[PDB]
């Protein structure tokens, strides 16, 4: 309980290290108290706080960071919008599906792959999916009829 | 005239280099940046001239790691060898001869060999190299073995004599010197001429018998390592006609392949501290070369057999009183030559007396001298190396770390048996 | 030979490597911000080995502070010297191991090892001449035990000649209470039998008893412990750390100190033992080659009798004769010769640093590859059966994906390597 | 809050209460209450000096 | 004695390089005849330390069978080989080895130099007067040394105004060696040029003179 307010003043501290430690840890707790705080570090000037923010709120996984981390997606920094999406499968919520099928065209490598395996996770992503970050829209069909003739290391996913 | 060329290989061979240059410059009236601000050039042989009287060694060092070398860069003589002369690596040999010869010293041998290649096209007749380097280090067995190697391929008919560092447990830093000390010695065997191996025990123990040093330093050890480099060398740097040069001093000293180990034996060594020196006479220190206190390896040469006997005297030192100091010698019983040999004593003067370094621990002497015998003496110290190899051997100790790094178990057992042969080569001679 | 990359990983890893930090920077003249306020050049001249130098004159360990738990990088980060450390060398995760080994080497840690890399990279790329790798950790938890050894084994990998050298804290039922402990214990032996150099077994059991029997301290906590290691450490890193011919880097120490590769699990030892709020009365030179050998002041539970010495590293710290020093090396060595191996002729090598480690004027610390270290293991062994035999909550590590058979195959080399130890006690130069 | 140079040392063995299997059979039953990874061979890092 | 001579002439074809030159060194020192023909086979061995030990042998044993093969041995590309050819050539006095010992006074190596011009100076030829006081203006003292030497046991007076020049040398050991040979060679022409020196000259080479009229009258 002490804690979880601790880290939540942290949040506020001038050092961005002590910043993303906290975001770090209030992601650990999972307390909800900290949801309103972290999506308050989601505009913060540095890039390793916003993506700790990111992370957190998956791992409460609370409803309310559904609309900030959606507009997190179209952060300048790749590992904000990779953290926001993993976030966004990770709290199931159907909002997060039209931003996530926008971000399966991403310039990133990384940024969209996370948005595949996202997908899969929360049926109007069959066909933007359809179309080695190959082999987590692979597997997202699997997870998710319309996806047997597509398949015809993108090897290992073809059954299911 | 005919040059030498001195390479310094590893901490040891490099702070030697260090000492020995420092005597030389003094010697011939050199200052520590060439300059000579004093008819009798002789010193041309170790030193090459450039512009108006810039005299640069002729010299390489080299190691396989920075910071021995990179003191003599920003010391006392920074301004005497060319930068291209001194040569270093990164990363040592870790005291793992196999490091210094297959894995480390392979990516620094060429640089090494052009840098010796420009020293060697500077010589109007090059006679041949001296060697300096220890026994236990892994640069000073591995990457000598390795330069010795290649030197007789790019050299061949030029001379090669070494300066080792025989170990002793009083100054050594690894428990694996025995093992590097005979996998030196078996691959330099067929490429070196002559080896001149200074026990750093005997060097210890003449500093504190004689200097009164209780525990001698590096610097203390290597300045009267010099005095000995120095003697053997001046028939090299002096003009004389009572001296000995190189090939009949190594024809005679060392005529047989393979045992080529003399037992150097060098006095006076007198304490600059003594408050008054009489000065000793040819006869007084011809006699302290047959007491073992003063010789650079410790052994028993008086139950041991000569095959060759040279005195290299230098200073006041009139021929009449060699001879004179030599028909006492003839008469010790201690002194027994092999059968099929010839009894006799090379001579060899120097005009110029030891020179004394200020700030040294060695007195001002009138007259010194150097005596070099071929004696089977001397196996007793490849006995005491060859029974050590022998005990952690037979468990394999420490040869993992040599394997790892480009060597072979034959290899260790090739110089084992190669040091055996050895050990036989000198019981055979001195048979009775 | 001269930067050496430091990885602290878990609780234990971060709290002894925190501690280490602030002892080695009082030593070397670095305050709590990173600046130099020394005054000898001694404390600068190797500073390079485990300082990097920032503009400002600025000298920042080159440490890299890893944990699944962000708890740990907040605690390291308030502590006296936590302002030392580089912000970007903190990688950290949202996550724990939860005391299991699986959860620290092959899920929750291999999600998190590639960000510990590209910093361990970045460290190494800007070396003149890496030495290697130095790991704080401990055997019985997830993240320094599992994390650490995945660590290990990817920076092996990469840097397959550099040397791997750790200081691992062995488990104890009378520090922890997590039944676990001997399993991940077990586990990481046998990764640190085959993937490092030289590993100090810093026990938890000798700890707990200096402090308790020999420190008096009736009711001891973790900073008693670690204060023990703290100066184990500052000791046996001295050779490292300043000038001298003899171990001064991790390579000719391995050289010096292995001579089978899986013989390199080390007892250090030290004199004289102290408590964190007692101030010290001089040892004579003879008193400190007593003690360094002393049973009571070996960190790791083996009685060195038991056993015989493959080799010894020696280190006296302080003003004092080295005439007296090599009587009483030689002296120790003469008295009981039977427990130093005979075919390793001059196996105990002693080193001398003029300045002593802080609130005393003379100490010595020792290094020594004794095959009575094998009691350590087989104590483990004995803790490790006893739960394997019944597959007591090996669910926990097979729910991870952990095949049982790697149980088998540690527990299998861990007793392997008893067996040699015991092989090389009964050896004879004969 | 407390200092982390005095955080407690929690011993598993209970004083006049556990020694031996009473800490372990204790534990056991109550845990009985509530793709395998290729993994490191024996001697495989010797190998590595070859 | 008869079977060791016979055991060392067998060890010369022995693997050994060792061997070898341990067995040309001992033939020498016994100096038998028998071993003359192995040791001539010997001075084309493709070891130099078993060449030289055989070289060495030759000149000791005295036989002037070995005088062709000892003067086919100074071109050799080992300083160690043509040394011990030289000393043996000298050793053994034949007058074949004049011309190639006038030679071997231009060598590289001062080992060979000084011992080409003693070996001269034992042989006692006329031929080598000419060269030997080229060799008075050598770089090294110890061959200025050998050849003042050498000139005073050949005792030809063409020698004499160069011994005179030898007496201002910068070595103490040349300008003594070249006084020893100018009396060495002695007569008139010796005696007017110490009359000359008594009274023009200066240092040593003015004591010399002095000295040399106060015995010769
Ligand atoms: N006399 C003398 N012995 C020395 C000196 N330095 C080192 N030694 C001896 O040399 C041996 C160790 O070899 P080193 O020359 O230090 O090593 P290295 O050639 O640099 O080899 P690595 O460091 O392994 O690459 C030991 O027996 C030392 O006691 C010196 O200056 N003088
Ligand atoms: N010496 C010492 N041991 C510790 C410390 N913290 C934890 N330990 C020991 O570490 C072992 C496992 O704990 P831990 O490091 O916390 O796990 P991790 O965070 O998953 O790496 C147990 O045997 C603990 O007693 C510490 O600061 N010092
Ligand atoms: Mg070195």
């Known amino acids: 309980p002490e804690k979880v307010e601790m880290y939540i003043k942290n949040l506020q501290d001038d050092s961005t290290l002590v910043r993303s430690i906290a975001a770090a840890a209030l992601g650990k707790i999972g307390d909800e108290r900290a949801v309103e705080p972290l999506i308050k570090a989601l505009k913060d000037e540095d890039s390793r706080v916003r993506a700790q923010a990111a992370g957190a709120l998956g791992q409460i996984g609370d409803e309310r960071a559904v609309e900030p981390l959606i507009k997190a997606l179209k952060d300048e920094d790749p590992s904000v919008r990779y953290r926001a999406a993993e976030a966004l499968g990770k709290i199931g919520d159907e909002r997060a599906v039209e931003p996530l099928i926008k971000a399966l065209k991403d310039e990133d490598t990384t940024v969209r792959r996370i948005a595949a395996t996202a997908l899969g996770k929360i049926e109007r992503a069959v066909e933007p999916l359809i179309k080695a970050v190959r082999l987590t829209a692979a597997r997202a069909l699997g997870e998710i009829e319309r996806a047997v003739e597509p398949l015809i290391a993108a090897a290992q996913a073809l059954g299911k | 005239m005919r040059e030498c060329i001195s390479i310094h290989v590893g901490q040891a061979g490099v702070q030697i280099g260090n000492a020995c240059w420092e005597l030389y410059c003094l010697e011939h009236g050199i200052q520590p940046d060439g300059q000579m601000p004093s008819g009798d050039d002789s010193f041309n042989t170790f030193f090459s001239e450039t512009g108006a009287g810039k005299h640069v060694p002729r010299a390489v060092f080299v190691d396989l790691e920075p910071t021995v070398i990179d003191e003599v860069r920003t010391g006392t003589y920074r301004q005497l060898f060319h930068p291209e002369q001194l040569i270093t690596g990164k990363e040592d040999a870790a005291n793992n001869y196999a490091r210094g010869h297959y894995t480390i010293g392979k990516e620094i041998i060429d640089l090494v060999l052009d840098r010796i290649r420009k020293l060697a096209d500077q010589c109007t007749g090059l006679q041949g190299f001296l060697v300096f380097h220890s026994f236990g280090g ?268 480009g060597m072979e178990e034959g290899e260790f057992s090739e110089a084992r048996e190669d040091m055996a042969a050895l050990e036989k080569d000198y019981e055979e001679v001195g048979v009775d | 030979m001269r930067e050496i990359v430091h990885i602290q990983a878990g609780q234990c890893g971060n709290q002894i490597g925190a501690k280490f930090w602030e002892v080695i920077s009082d030593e070397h003249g670095i305050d709590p911000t990173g600046s130099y306020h020394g005054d000898s050049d001694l404390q600068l001249e190797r500073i390079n080995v485990y300082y990097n130098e920032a503009t400002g004159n600025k000298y920042v360990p080159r440490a890299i502070l890893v944990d699944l738990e962000p708890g740990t990088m907040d605690s390291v980060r308030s502590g006296p010297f936590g302002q030392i450390f580089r912000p970007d060398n903190f990688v950290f995760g949202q996550s724990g191991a939860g005391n299991n080994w699986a959860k620290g080497h092959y899920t929750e840690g291999a999600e998190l090892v590639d960000s510990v890399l590209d910093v361990v990279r970045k460290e190494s790329e800007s070396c003149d001449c890496l030495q290697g790798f130095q790991l704080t950790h401990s055997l019985g938890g997830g993240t320094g035990s599992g994390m650490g050894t995945l660590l290990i084994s990817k920076i092996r990998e990469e840097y397959p000649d550099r040397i791997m050298n750790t200081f691992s804290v062995m488990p104890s039922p009378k520090v922890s209470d997590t039944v676990v402990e001997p399993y991940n214990a077990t586990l990481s032996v046998h990764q640190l039998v085959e993937n490092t150099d030289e590993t100090y077994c810093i026990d938890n059991e000798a700890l707990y008893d200096i402090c308790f029997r020999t420190l008096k301290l009736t009711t001891p906590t973790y900073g008693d412990l670690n204060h023990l290691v703290s100066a184990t450490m500052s000791g046996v890193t001295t050779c490292l750390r300043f000038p001298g011919q003899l171990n001064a880097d991790l390579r000719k120490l391995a050289v010096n100190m292995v001579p089978f590769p899986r013989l390199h699990f080390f007892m250090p030892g030290f004199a004289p033992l102290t408590s964190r709020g007692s101030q010290q009365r001089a040892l004579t030179v003879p008193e400190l080659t007593q003690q360094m050998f002393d049973s009571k002041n070996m960190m790791a539970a083996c009685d060195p009798r038991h056993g015989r010495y493959l080799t010894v590293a020696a280190i006296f710290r302080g003003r004092m004769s080295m005439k007296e020093v090599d009587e009483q090396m030689l002296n120790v060595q003469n008295k009981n010769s039977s427990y130093f191996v005979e075919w390793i002729p001059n196996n105990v090598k002693t080193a001398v640093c003029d300045i002593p480690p802080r609130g005393l004027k003379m100490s010595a610390t020792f290094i020594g590859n004794s095959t009575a270290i094998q009691e350590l293991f087989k104590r483990i062994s004995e803790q490790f059966t006893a739960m394997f035999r019944r597959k007591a909550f090996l669910h926990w590590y097979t729910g991870e994906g952990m095949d049982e058979m790697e149980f088998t195959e540690a527990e299998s080399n861990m007793n392997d390597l008893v067996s040699e130890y015991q092989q090389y006690q009964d050896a004879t130069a004969d | 809050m407390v200092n982390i140079e005095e955080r407690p040392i929690k011993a598993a063995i209970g004083e006049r209460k556990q020694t031996f299997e009473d800490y372990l059979e204790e534990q056991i039953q109550l845990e009985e209450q509530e793709p395998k990874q290729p993994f490191l061979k024996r001697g495989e890092g010797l190998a590595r000096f070859t």
């Open chain 2, 138 to 405: 892994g640069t000073g067995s591995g990457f000598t073995s390795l330069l010795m190697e290649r030197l007789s391929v790019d050299y061949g008919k030029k001379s090669k004599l070494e300066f080792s560092i025989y170990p002793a447990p009083q100054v050594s830093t690894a428990v694996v010197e025995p093992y590097n000390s005979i996998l030196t010695t078996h691959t330099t065997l067929e490429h070196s001429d002559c080896a001149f191996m200074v026990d750093n025990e005997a060097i210890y123990d003449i500093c504190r018998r004689n200097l009164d040093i209780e525990r001698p330093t590096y610097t203390n050890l290597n300045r009267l390592i010099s005095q000995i480099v120095s003697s053997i060398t001046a028939s090299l740097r002096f003009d004389g006609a009572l001296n000995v040069d190189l090939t009949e001093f190594q024809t005679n000293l060392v005529p047989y392949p393979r045992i080529h180990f003399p037992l150097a034996t060098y006095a006076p060594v007198i304490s600059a501290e003594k408050a008054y020196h009489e000065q000793l006479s040819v006869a007084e220190i011809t006699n302290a070369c047959f007491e073992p206190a003063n010789q650079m390896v410790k052994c028993d040469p008086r139950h041991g057999k000569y095959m060759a006997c040279c005195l290299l005297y230098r200073g006041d030192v009139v021929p009449k009183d060699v001879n004179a100091a030599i028909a006492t010698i003839k008469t010790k019983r201690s002194i027994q030559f092999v059968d099929w040999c010839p009894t006799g004593f090379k001579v060899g003067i120097n005009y110029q007396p030891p020179t004394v370094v200020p700030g040294g621990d060695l007195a001002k002497v009138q007259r010194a001298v150097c005596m070099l015998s071929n004696t089977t003496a001397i196996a007793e110290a490849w006995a005491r190396l060859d029974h050590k190899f022998d005990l952690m051997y037979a468990k394999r100790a420490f040869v993992h770390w040599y394997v790892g790094e």
